[PDB]
Ligand binder design. Sequence first.
Ligand code: G2I
Ligand SMILES: OC[C@H]1O[C@@H](O[C@H]2[C@H](O)[C@@H](O)[C@H](O)O[C@@H]2CO)[C@H](O)[C@@H](O)[C@@H]1O
Ligand code: CA
Ligand code: ZN
Length: 530
Amino acid sequence: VPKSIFYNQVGYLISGDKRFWIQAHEPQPFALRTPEGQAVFAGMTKPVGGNWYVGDFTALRVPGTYTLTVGTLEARVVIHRRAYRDVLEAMLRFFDYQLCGVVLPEDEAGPWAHGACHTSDAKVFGTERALACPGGWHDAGDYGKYTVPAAKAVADLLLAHEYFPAALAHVRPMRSVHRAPHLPPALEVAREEIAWLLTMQDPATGGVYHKVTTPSFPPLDTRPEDDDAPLVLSPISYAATATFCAAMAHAALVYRPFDPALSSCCADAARRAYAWLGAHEMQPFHNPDGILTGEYGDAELRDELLWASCALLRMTGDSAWARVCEPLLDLDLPWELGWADVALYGVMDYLRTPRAAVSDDVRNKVKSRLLRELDALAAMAESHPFGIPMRDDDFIWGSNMVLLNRAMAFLLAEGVGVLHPAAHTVAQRAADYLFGANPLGQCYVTGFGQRPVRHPHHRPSVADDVDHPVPGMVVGGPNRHLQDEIARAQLAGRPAMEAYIDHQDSYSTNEVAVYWNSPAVFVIAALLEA
Ligand SMILES: OC[C@H]1CNC[C@@H](O)[C@@H]1O[C@@H]1O[C@H](CO)[C@@H](O[C@@H]2O[C@H](CO)[C@@H](O)[C@H](O)[C@H]2O)[C@H](O)[C@H]1O
Ligand SMILES: OC[C@H]1O[C@@H](O[C@H]2[C@H](O)[C@@H](O)[C@H](O)O[C@@H]2CO)[C@H](O)[C@@H](O)[C@@H]1O
Ligand SMILES: [Ca+2]
Ligand SMILES: [Zn+2]
């Protein structure tokens, strides 16, 4: 914990809420000054519990770089019209930096450029059958491409495009690595993953392979193009087939006015996947022998079927689908945004379907439960010193995604008549926390803030002779379970929010992932929208 001011190290929006935190004993006066030193705003800090005091300077609407002064402490804060444009663009460009089997030229990628990687055909596990499944994204700090988390990353980007297209219009991805005519930014980026996902479906049965990876993780010091181990397609899985179905049905809708051929192809692929679901058992995935890469296992598969059923309901607008959706909507499944518990994606597709196609009575029950869920998140946020909807027990592996998915839920609900008053405050607080407003004063995104992430568990950043890591990567964040050797040795006994270390070997607190950037893209685009 540093002895300083804790604030949003990226900046504050002219019209947004503006807050800073300090560990203090009592209220103190504070001032905001122009770079010369003249006071422009003054106020008194107020208690928020657990050693914390806050200062609110929301009413300062003049853009600029200000010196915030409290006690003997100083901080430089930025107020701007589009304070989050650069970070949103870097968070979206991260997916292009993760591209597999694609030359990333220096004019686009800069020092983090590299040649086409993993270009060989993959072998179907337990067969001699080879299959070409290039493209898409390296999942995270490793090079595997896993279907289940890929579905979440795609759905989050499609949702961000559906909700906030104007915010997204101001950002530029690695445009020259993508096919022309160029689509809106989130759609152009997500199409690379959608194209790869289509190659993961077995033409014979409609089933989808769980993942394509090397048999084991290569050393942390491996460049993408030096990873020459043979590629293996792990068996078809129910979770993969169901999450693929839902992501493809969602992409068929969203791409309809932009890429008709892709849209039609995704719609056909989603239906064949749904036919596979109806003919096979809900069997959890487990790594086969000799496969040591990310398992993405899950014993509960009704939420995946719920999402797949609701996605096709909205895709077709056919009331026939509501017969399967509605009983699944009644289950005591957690209503979350993945990667393992995905029911809220289905709830959203259901609630976004024209009313005439669904039971009004079920629809009202669905909306009421969503409001109760958001009230419970609002209560967590009210008791948190940083105003984020988190409890100490939520600081697990990928706790930043847990936070962002929760902010995302409030924002999504606004599109379906569920208007919680805390929605915008929660989104701002999630961004503030992600950008430094936390007990470690840590900005959880590489290349941004005054205390950026410098040593992520990310093979390209470790392996290159740059690190100085690839920018715009959201790290997993604090995980109280100490799920790596560095966390066990250096973070024992520390509070849940302090269970993070910016060390390359801390994969349980400091890895990056396509499905950790995807809710951040949604949340940051929502704030930029306003
Ligand atoms: O670390 C990011 C990913 C890097 N690519 C390999 C993937 O396998 C890895 O995924 C992560 O894999 C972890 C190790 O299996 C998953 O961690 C688990 O996260 C769970 C909650 O998401 C915790 O309950 C559980 O204690 C913890 O083990 C975590 O969610 C999930 O993001
Ligand atoms: O737990 C999965 C985690 O593993 C990381 O690879 C580790 C590997 O598990 C360990 O056995 C070996 O000694 O070290 C490597 C590199 O630290 C992998 O890089 C992560 O993507 C993954 O989440
Ligand atoms: Ca599940
Ligand atoms: Zn690759």
